[PDB]
Amino acid sequence: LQVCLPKGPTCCSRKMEEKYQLTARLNMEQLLQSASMELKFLIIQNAAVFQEAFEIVVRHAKNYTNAMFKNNYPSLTPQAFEFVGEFFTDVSLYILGSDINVDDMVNELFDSLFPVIYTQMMNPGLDINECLRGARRDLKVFGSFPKLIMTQVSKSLQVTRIFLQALNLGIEVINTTDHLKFSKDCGRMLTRMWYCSYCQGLMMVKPCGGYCNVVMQGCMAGVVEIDKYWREYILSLEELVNDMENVLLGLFSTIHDSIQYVQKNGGKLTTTIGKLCTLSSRRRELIQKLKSFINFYSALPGYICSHSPVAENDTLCWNGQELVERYSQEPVVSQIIDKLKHINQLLRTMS
Amino acid sequence: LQVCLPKGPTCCSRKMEEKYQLTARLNMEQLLQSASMELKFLIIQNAAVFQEAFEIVVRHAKNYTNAMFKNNYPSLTPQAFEFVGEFFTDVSLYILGSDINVDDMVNELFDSLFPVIYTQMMNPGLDINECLRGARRDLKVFGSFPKLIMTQVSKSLQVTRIFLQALNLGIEVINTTDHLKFSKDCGRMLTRMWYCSYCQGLMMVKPCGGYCNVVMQGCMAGVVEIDKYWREYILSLEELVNDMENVLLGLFSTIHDSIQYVQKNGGKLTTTIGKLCTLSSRRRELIQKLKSFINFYSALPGYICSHSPVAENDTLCWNGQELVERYSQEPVVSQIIDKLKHINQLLRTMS
Amino acid sequence: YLRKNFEQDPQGREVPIEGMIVLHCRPPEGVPAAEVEWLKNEEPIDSEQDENIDTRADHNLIIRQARLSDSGNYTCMAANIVAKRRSLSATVVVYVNGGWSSWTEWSACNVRCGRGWQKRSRTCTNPAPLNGGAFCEGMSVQKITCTA
Amino acid sequence: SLDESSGLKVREVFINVTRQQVEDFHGPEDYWCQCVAWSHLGTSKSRKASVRIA
Ligand SMILES: *[C@@H]1O[C@H](CO)[C@@H](O)[C@H](O)[C@H]1NC(C)=O
Ligand SMILES: *[C@@H]1O[C@H](CO)[C@@H](O)[C@H](O)[C@H]1NC(C)=O
Ligand SMILES: *[C@@H]1O[C@H](CO)[C@@H](O)[C@H](O)[C@H]1NC(C)=O
Ligand SMILES: *[C@@H]1O[C@H](CO)[C@@H](O)[C@H](O)[C@H]1NC(C)=O
Ligand SMILES: *[C@H]1O[C@H](CO)[C@@H](O)[C@H](O)[C@@H]1O
Secondary structure (H helix, E strand, O other), X not given: OOXXXXXXXOOOOHHHHHHHHHHHHHHHXXXXXXXXXXXXXXXXXXXXXHHHHHHHHHHHHXXXXXXXHHHHOHHHXXXXXXHHHHHXXXXXXXXXXXXXXXXXHHHHHHHHHHHHXXXXXXXXXXXXXXXXXXXXXXXXXXXXXXXXHHHHHHHHHHHHHHHHHHHHHHHHHHHXXXXXXXXXXXXXXXXXXXXXXXXXXXXXXXXXXXXXXHHHHHHOOOOOOHHHHHHHHHHHHHHHHOOOHHHHHHHHHHHHHHHHHHHHXXXXXXXXXXXXXXXXXXXXXXXXXXHHHOOOOOOHHHHHHHHOOOEOOOEEEEOOOOEEEEOOOOHHHHHHXXXXXXHHHHHXXXX | OOOOOOOOOOOOOHHHHHHHHHHHHHHHHHHHHHHHHHHHHHHHHHHHHHHHHHHHHHHHHHHHHHHHHHHXXXXXXXXXXXXXXXXXXXXXHHHOOOOOOHHHHHHHHHHHHHHXXXXXXXXXXXXXXXXXXXXXXXXXXXXXXXXXXXXXHHHHHHHHHHHHHHHHHHHXXXXXXXXOOOOHHHHHHHHHHHOHHHHOOOOOOOEEHHHHHHHHHHHOHHHHOHHHHHHHHHHHHXXXXXXXXXXXXXXXXXXXXXXXXXXXXXXXXXXXXXHHOOHHHHHHHHHHHHHHHOOOOOOHHHHHHHHOOOEOOOEEEEOOOOEEEEOOOOHHHHHHHHHHXXXXXXXXXXX | OEOOOOOXXXXXOEEOOOOOEEEEOEOOOEOOOOXXXXXXXXXXXXXXXXXXXXXXXOOXXXXXXXXXXXXEEEEEEEEXXXXXXXXXXXXEEEOEOOOOOOOOOOOOOOOOOOEEEEEXXXXXXXXXXXXXXXXXXXXXXXXXXXXX | OXXXXXXXXXXXXXXXXXXXXXXXXXXXXXXXXXXXXXXOOOEEEOOOEEOOOO
């Protein structure tokens, strides 16, 4: 045998020892999953809700911009629908982590918007399109409106993008916790603590509380080190919540005022161009519920021992090898800590 | 037999046929080497002579610059000798084809020159050296002198470098000609034309002139196609010769005037810095001698037949299989043409 | 819908005269699937015109020998029923390394009596550097003192 | 010189080597130098120190 220390005879072979080891693995995984389930479901719920809510906000803002174009500038439709749809598509693509340039979104928006304004509103009556696109930026026809929108939307979209990435990475690490594979020595110690009493012919004897403590503090020496980074993660997320609905929803008013501004100088512009050519409540409740789990990694061995069958009195208990009257007395964790450090730096910088 | 067409009996076995094939290979290679030797030695001689002449010019120019530093600016020696030697060493290294940046040569020259000027000429009396080096470019102390020298020397050094590269590549292709391996079918045809007459017991019979013509135009179909590119190479080299001695030799006057220019603003500069911190004959003779070999690739099969033993009368001659009264009637080449096209484009862009 | 950002732009490469290089291109996400076309120096290349160049089903430009297809600014362009998108042009430059020469024979001692000289040349021509290839490393001439 | 460990004639020779000598030297090998000492019994050569332009 390689696990069950044979003091007398034994009622179990090597294959039964392997079966007990696999059942020990399954029991540890089930206990960790039961410890992590409440927090996992909380973060999954909130991640799903925030993702759907941001998509709803983007769709509604695109709808409102399209509706205000339909009502106030019918001469710019249906071209207006194309560039508005492209703009808000790129908005959503940026929110969901794709490589999109915010300044380029706004600049392509105004580049597409100016030629149809000139041809349908200012000078009524395809090849000259690029000359108009160049004149848009060369003559600064929209004034400071493009840079105003650029900063207004970049500031909110970056915090939203990093909020979603932080929620997803929290889900990732919490899913990793209950799937943390342990050392072989810990496998054998857990097998001894939970099952090796059956090999000695005992039916209902439980392991000592102190033996459970030494075993758990033995194989969770790495997992407990995650607690500092998890606390910093929680506090940095709290720093970040203290934004994007208001901006995307006022975009239509800002664009309308920019169109008025360009129409204001039409006299000189046409001649020159003719010559030349409940959310805040949700994030607050989320942070207040997330602060209740700041001790998650430090209380984990206590959970494993308090939810495993143990003799708390340390009397007539199993010490891993014999029935006593009184008890005598990294790689995946490294990846978790790496990702936590990364997301914590990213969080703190948006502050 | 696989080469000697047996019309009657035969005095030679298969191994004698292999021996005749290898002797045919050696004879063809020797004939090509004899054809190419004059031109190869001409280009090798000129490459060597021009290399030595350019090195002599660079050494003389470095000597002249050092002498005018000794005479006009003794306070800048011996540091002046260090940066002049480094400058002209990099000059020669660029001339000989090494990856050297001309702008970097001039900029490092002035970067090294300014601190010793400041410490010995402007403010008489190691750690502050980098602050002076930065101030050289940040305050544009040398005016337009660095860019003037930069263009002045880059223009001549690039044409000289490409002249040397062109000479070397001509050597390369002329060296390849006599090492041109041919097809197996041509090996067998040359064996028949030169030796298979011996297998039929003939002692002094020579192949027919027309048979030599068909065989040579048979295996030189690829090599003759090089003639266009070789002619264009010759003419482009002629285009290039129609410049670097004068520039490198006036360098000292230009640098002296630049030093005067910097000394002219010393009043403000010291306070601000204290607060802040027969050749043309040779290339003509070379081109006139190189134009005598413009037909080299087109006259090559004529050379092979006129220097191989052939019956020019085409009477009582060997036709590859029998003695008659009257006669009836590539990857490496691709590389040669590729390099010729490349060097010809480079030449034409230069002039 | 066609995207502006290319999924993977072609990378510029340095390849010897005999080396082989594959230029990768991942067109932007779009319905229908983007039609990838290769352009050498803003001019399309024909895969059937030369054996050395061929177009792959997964949008890759493979060059076996740097001889039949020399240097240039290769650019990948995706075409769709919506519009066209140009990728970042890759500067593919083919370099030839410097290759010296077989030694020559030692020259005769110029001086009949006393200290003489003997020279031996080693040129950089097998192969000669091209398109900015690294020059030969070391000395080109060999000189020895002789006593006649 | 005279050595302390043993009363025997010691000789120390220094020779200056300038940059101009190395850059103008076009020999086959790297600019090397050897030391030859003469005695009443014979001669002895030293290591070939090659002075090169860094
Ligand atoms: C926008 O809102 C109006 C409200 O009447 C609705 O009729 C229309 O279908 C909506 N458009 C989009 C694209 O949601
Ligand atoms: C964790 O992710 C894995 C991926 O297969 C999945 O199997 C598992 O159900 C997820 N975790 C939880 C605890 O629900
Ligand atoms: C290729 O690109 C570079 C800059 O991207 C440029 O200097 C060069 O002239 C271009 N032209 C070609 C290869 O035709
Ligand atoms: C000619 O080719 C031969 C092949 O051995 C080579 O050894 C010799 O260096 C060549 N001459 C050159 C490179 O100019
Ligand atoms: C030419 O000389 C030698 C060959 O022995 C190498 O150092 C190198 O390949 C060089 O270019």
